[PDB]
Amino acid sequence: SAMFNQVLILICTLLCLVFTGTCGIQHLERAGEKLSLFKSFYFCIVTFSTVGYGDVTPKIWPSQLLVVIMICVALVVLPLQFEELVYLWMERQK
């Protein structure tokens, strides 16, 4: 089942990115302005959902960039997998 396979890849990647985001915001903002993990989950899923509320964001030199870098990579990485998911839907139709 390829449909299944890429569904998995999507989920895996999402999970990975969420994890990287939690782990990303965890050690940094924990210094200057302390934030709970749920705030991170929020931010991550707020970034990959393309929402961007802005209640709390990075105020620090590296902190923004790191989030940014992860997004930029994600924004390339995001469609790769959606693109993938599309390819199978085309195979299923065939």
CSV table of N, CA and C in Angstrom, one decimal:
chain,number,residue,atom,x,y,z
A,1,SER,N,0.8,-1.2,0.0
A,1,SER,CA,0.0,0.0,0.0
A,1,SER,C,0.9,1.3,0.0
A,2,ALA,N,1.0,1.9,-1.2
A,2,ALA,CA,1.7,3.2,-1.3
A,2,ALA,C,1.0,4.4,-0.7
A,3,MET,N,-0.3,4.4,-0.9
A,3,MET,CA,-1.1,5.4,-0.3
A,3,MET,C,-0.8,5.5,1.2
A,4,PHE,N,-0.9,4.3,1.8
A,4,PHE,CA,-0.5,4.1,3.2
A,4,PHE,C,0.9,4.6,3.5
A,5,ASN,N,1.8,4.2,2.7
A,5,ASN,CA,3.3,4.5,2.9
A,5,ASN,C,3.4,6.0,3.0
A,6,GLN,N,2.9,6.8,2.0
A,6,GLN,CA,3.1,8.2,2.1
A,6,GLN,C,2.3,8.9,3.1
A,7,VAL,N,1.1,8.4,3.4
A,7,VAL,CA,0.4,8.9,4.6
A,7,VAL,C,1.3,8.8,5.8
A,8,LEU,N,1.9,7.7,6.0
A,8,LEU,CA,2.9,7.5,7.0
A,8,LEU,C,4.0,8.5,6.9
A,9,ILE,N,4.6,8.6,5.8
A,9,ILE,CA,5.7,9.6,5.6
A,9,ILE,C,5.2,11.0,6.1
A,10,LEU,N,4.1,11.4,5.6
A,10,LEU,CA,3.5,12.7,6.0
A,10,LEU,C,3.4,12.8,7.5
A,11,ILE,N,2.8,11.9,8.2
A,11,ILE,CA,2.6,11.9,9.6
A,11,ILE,C,4.0,11.9,10.3
A,12,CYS,N,4.9,11.0,9.9
A,12,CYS,CA,6.2,10.9,10.4
A,12,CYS,C,6.9,12.3,10.4
A,13,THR,N,6.9,12.9,9.2
A,13,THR,CA,7.6,14.2,9.0
A,13,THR,C,6.9,15.3,9.9
A,14,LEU,N,5.6,15.3,9.9
A,14,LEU,CA,4.9,16.3,10.7
A,14,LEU,C,5.4,16.1,12.2
A,15,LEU,N,5.3,14.9,12.7
A,15,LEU,CA,5.7,14.6,14.0
A,15,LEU,C,7.2,15.0,14.3
A,16,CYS,N,8.1,14.7,13.3
A,16,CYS,CA,9.5,15.0,13.4
A,16,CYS,C,9.6,16.5,13.6
A,17,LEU,N,9.0,17.3,12.7
A,17,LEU,CA,9.0,18.7,12.7
A,17,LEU,C,8.5,19.3,14.0
A,18,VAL,N,7.4,18.8,14.5
A,18,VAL,CA,6.8,19.2,15.8
A,18,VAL,C,7.9,19.0,16.8
A,19,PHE,N,8.5,17.8,16.9
A,19,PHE,CA,9.5,17.5,17.8
A,19,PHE,C,10.7,18.4,17.7
A,20,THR,N,11.2,18.7,16.5
A,20,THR,CA,12.3,19.6,16.3
A,20,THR,C,11.9,21.0,16.8
A,21,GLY,N,10.7,21.4,16.6
A,21,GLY,CA,10.2,22.7,17.0
A,21,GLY,C,10.1,22.8,18.6
A,22,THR,N,9.6,21.8,19.2
A,22,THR,CA,9.5,21.8,20.7
A,22,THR,C,11.0,21.8,21.2
A,23,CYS,N,11.8,20.9,20.7
A,23,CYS,CA,13.2,20.8,21.1
A,23,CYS,C,13.9,22.1,20.7
A,24,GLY,N,13.5,22.8,19.7
A,24,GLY,CA,14.1,24.0,19.2
A,24,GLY,C,13.8,25.2,20.1
A,25,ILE,N,12.6,25.4,20.5
A,25,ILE,CA,12.2,26.5,21.3
A,25,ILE,C,12.5,26.2,22.8
A,26,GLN,N,12.6,24.9,23.1
A,26,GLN,CA,12.8,24.4,24.5
A,26,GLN,C,14.0,25.1,25.2
A,27,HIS,N,15.2,24.9,24.6
A,27,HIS,CA,16.4,25.3,25.2
A,27,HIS,C,16.7,26.8,25.1
A,28,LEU,N,16.1,27.5,24.2
A,28,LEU,CA,16.5,28.9,23.9
A,28,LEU,C,15.7,29.9,24.7
A,29,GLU,N,14.4,30.0,24.4
A,29,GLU,CA,13.5,30.9,25.2
A,29,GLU,C,13.4,30.6,26.6
A,30,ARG,N,13.8,29.3,27.0
A,30,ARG,CA,13.9,28.9,28.4
A,30,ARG,C,14.9,29.8,29.2
A,31,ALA,N,15.7,30.6,28.5
A,31,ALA,CA,16.6,31.5,29.2
A,31,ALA,C,16.0,32.9,29.3
A,32,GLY,N,15.8,33.6,28.2
A,32,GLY,CA,15.4,35.0,28.3
A,32,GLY,C,13.9,35.1,28.8
A,33,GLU,N,13.0,34.5,28.1
A,33,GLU,CA,11.6,34.5,28.6
A,33,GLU,C,11.0,33.1,28.6
A,34,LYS,N,10.8,32.6,29.8
A,34,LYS,CA,10.4,31.2,29.9
A,34,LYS,C,9.1,30.8,29.4
A,35,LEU,N,9.0,29.8,28.6
A,35,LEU,CA,7.8,29.3,27.9
A,35,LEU,C,7.6,27.8,28.1
A,36,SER,N,6.3,27.4,28.4
A,36,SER,CA,6.0,26.0,28.6
A,36,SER,C,6.0,25.3,27.2
A,37,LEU,N,6.1,23.9,27.3
A,37,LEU,CA,6.2,23.1,26.0
A,37,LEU,C,5.0,23.3,25.2
A,38,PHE,N,3.8,23.5,25.8
A,38,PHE,CA,2.6,23.6,25.1
A,38,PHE,C,2.6,24.8,24.2
A,39,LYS,N,3.3,25.9,24.7
A,39,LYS,CA,3.5,27.1,23.9
A,39,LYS,C,4.3,26.7,22.7
A,40,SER,N,5.3,25.8,22.8
A,40,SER,CA,6.1,25.4,21.7
A,40,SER,C,5.1,24.7,20.7
A,41,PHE,N,4.5,23.6,21.2
A,41,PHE,CA,3.6,22.9,20.3
A,41,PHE,C,2.7,23.9,19.5
A,42,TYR,N,2.1,24.8,20.3
A,42,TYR,CA,1.3,25.9,19.7
A,42,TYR,C,2.1,26.5,18.6
A,43,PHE,N,3.2,27.1,18.9
A,43,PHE,CA,4.0,27.8,17.9
A,43,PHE,C,4.3,27.0,16.6
A,44,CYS,N,4.8,25.8,16.8
A,44,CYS,CA,5.1,24.9,15.7
A,44,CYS,C,3.9,24.7,14.8
A,45,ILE,N,2.8,24.2,15.4
A,45,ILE,CA,1.6,23.9,14.7
A,45,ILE,C,1.0,25.2,14.2
A,46,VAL,N,1.4,26.3,14.8
A,46,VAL,CA,1.0,27.7,14.3
A,46,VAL,C,1.9,28.1,13.1
A,47,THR,N,3.1,27.6,13.0
A,47,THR,CA,4.0,27.9,11.9
A,47,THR,C,3.6,27.0,10.7
A,48,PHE,N,3.5,25.7,10.9
A,48,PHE,CA,3.2,24.8,9.8
A,48,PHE,C,1.8,24.8,9.3
A,49,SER,N,0.9,25.4,10.1
A,49,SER,CA,-0.5,25.6,9.8
A,49,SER,C,-0.6,26.9,9.0
A,50,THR,N,0.5,27.7,9.0
A,50,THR,CA,0.5,29.1,8.3
A,50,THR,C,-0.6,30.0,8.9
A,51,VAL,N,-0.6,30.1,10.2
A,51,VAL,CA,-1.5,30.9,11.0
A,51,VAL,C,-0.8,32.2,11.5
A,52,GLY,N,0.1,32.0,12.4
A,52,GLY,CA,0.9,33.1,12.9
A,52,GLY,C,0.2,34.2,13.8
A,53,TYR,N,-0.3,33.7,14.9
A,53,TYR,CA,-1.0,34.7,15.8
A,53,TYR,C,-0.1,35.8,16.3
A,54,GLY,N,1.0,35.4,17.0
A,54,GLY,CA,2.0,36.3,17.4
A,54,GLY,C,2.0,36.8,18.9
A,55,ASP,N,1.2,36.1,19.7
A,55,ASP,CA,1.2,36.4,21.2
A,55,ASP,C,2.6,36.4,21.7
A,56,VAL,N,3.4,35.4,21.4
A,56,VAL,CA,4.7,35.2,21.9
A,56,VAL,C,5.6,34.8,20.8
A,57,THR,N,6.8,35.5,20.6
A,57,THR,CA,7.7,35.2,19.5
A,57,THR,C,9.1,35.4,20.0
A,58,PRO,N,10.1,35.0,19.1
A,58,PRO,CA,11.5,35.2,19.6
A,58,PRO,C,11.9,36.6,19.5
A,59,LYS,N,12.5,37.1,20.6
A,59,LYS,CA,13.0,38.5,20.7
A,59,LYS,C,14.6,38.6,20.6
A,60,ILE,N,15.2,37.4,20.3
A,60,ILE,CA,16.7,37.3,20.5
A,60,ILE,C,17.3,37.1,19.2
A,61,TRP,N,18.6,37.4,19.1
A,61,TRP,CA,19.4,37.4,17.9
A,61,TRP,C,19.3,36.0,17.2
A,62,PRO,N,19.7,34.9,17.9
A,62,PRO,CA,19.6,33.6,17.2
A,62,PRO,C,18.2,33.0,17.1
A,63,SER,N,17.4,33.3,18.1
A,63,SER,CA,16.1,32.6,18.3
A,63,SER,C,15.2,32.7,17.1
A,64,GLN,N,15.1,33.9,16.5
A,64,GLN,CA,14.3,34.1,15.3
A,64,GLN,C,14.8,33.3,14.2
A,65,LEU,N,16.1,33.4,13.9
A,65,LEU,CA,16.7,32.7,12.8
A,65,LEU,C,16.5,31.2,12.9
A,66,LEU,N,16.7,30.6,14.0
A,66,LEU,CA,16.5,29.2,14.2
A,66,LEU,C,15.1,28.8,13.8
A,67,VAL,N,14.1,29.5,14.3
A,67,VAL,CA,12.7,29.3,13.9
A,67,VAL,C,12.6,29.4,12.4
A,68,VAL,N,13.1,30.6,11.9
A,68,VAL,CA,13.1,30.9,10.5
A,68,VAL,C,13.7,29.7,9.7
A,69,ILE,N,14.9,29.4,10.0
A,69,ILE,CA,15.6,28.3,9.3
A,69,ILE,C,14.8,27.1,9.2
A,70,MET,N,14.2,26.7,10.3
A,70,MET,CA,13.3,25.5,10.4
A,70,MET,C,12.1,25.6,9.5
A,71,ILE,N,11.6,26.8,9.4
A,71,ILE,CA,10.4,27.1,8.6
A,71,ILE,C,10.9,27.0,7.1
A,72,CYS,N,11.9,27.7,6.7
A,72,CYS,CA,12.4,27.7,5.3
A,72,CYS,C,12.7,26.3,4.9
A,73,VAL,N,13.4,25.5,5.7
A,73,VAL,CA,13.6,24.1,5.4
A,73,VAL,C,12.2,23.4,5.3
A,74,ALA,N,11.3,23.7,6.3
A,74,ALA,CA,10.0,23.1,6.3
A,74,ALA,C,9.2,23.4,5.0
A,75,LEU,N,9.3,24.7,4.7
A,75,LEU,CA,8.5,25.2,3.5
A,75,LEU,C,8.9,24.5,2.2
A,76,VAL,N,10.2,24.1,2.1
A,76,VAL,CA,10.6,23.3,1.0
A,76,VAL,C,10.2,21.8,1.3
A,77,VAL,N,10.4,21.4,2.5
A,77,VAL,CA,10.1,20.0,2.9
A,77,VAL,C,8.6,19.8,2.9
A,78,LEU,N,7.8,20.8,3.2
A,78,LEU,CA,6.4,20.6,3.3
A,78,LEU,C,5.8,20.1,1.9
A,79,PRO,N,6.0,20.9,0.9
A,79,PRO,CA,5.4,20.5,-0.4
A,79,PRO,C,6.0,19.2,-1.0
A,80,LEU,N,7.2,18.9,-0.7
A,80,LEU,CA,7.8,17.6,-1.2
A,80,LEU,C,6.9,16.5,-0.9
A,81,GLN,N,6.4,16.5,0.4
A,81,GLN,CA,5.5,15.4,0.9
A,81,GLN,C,4.1,15.5,0.4
A,82,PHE,N,3.6,16.7,0.3
A,82,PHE,CA,2.2,16.9,-0.3
A,82,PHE,C,2.3,16.5,-1.7
A,83,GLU,N,3.4,17.0,-2.4
A,83,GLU,CA,3.6,16.6,-3.8
A,83,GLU,C,3.6,15.1,-3.9
A,84,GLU,N,4.3,14.4,-3.0
A,84,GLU,CA,4.3,13.0,-2.9
A,84,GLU,C,2.9,12.4,-2.8
A,85,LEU,N,2.2,12.8,-1.8
A,85,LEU,CA,0.8,12.4,-1.6
A,85,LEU,C,-0.1,12.5,-2.8
A,86,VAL,N,0.1,13.6,-3.6
A,86,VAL,CA,-0.6,13.8,-4.8
A,86,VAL,C,-0.3,12.7,-5.8
A,87,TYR,N,1.0,12.4,-5.9
A,87,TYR,CA,1.5,11.4,-6.9
A,87,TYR,C,0.8,10.0,-6.8
A,88,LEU,N,0.5,9.6,-5.6
A,88,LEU,CA,-0.2,8.3,-5.3
A,88,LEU,C,-1.6,8.4,-5.7
A,89,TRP,N,-2.3,9.5,-5.2
A,89,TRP,CA,-3.7,9.7,-5.6
A,89,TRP,C,-3.9,9.6,-7.1
A,90,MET,N,-2.9,10.0,-7.8
A,90,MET,CA,-2.8,9.8,-9.3
A,90,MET,C,-2.7,8.3,-9.7
A,91,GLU,N,-1.9,7.6,-8.9
A,91,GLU,CA,-1.7,6.2,-9.1
A,91,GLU,C,-2.9,5.4,-8.8
A,92,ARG,N,-3.6,5.7,-7.7
A,92,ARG,CA,-4.8,5.1,-7.3
A,92,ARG,C,-5.9,5.2,-8.3
A,93,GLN,N,-6.0,6.4,-8.9
A,93,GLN,CA,-6.9,6.7,-10.0
A,93,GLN,C,-6.6,5.8,-11.2
A,94,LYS,N,-5.4,5.7,-11.5
A,94,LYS,CA,-5.0,4.9,-12.7
A,94,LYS,C,-5.4,3.5,-12.5
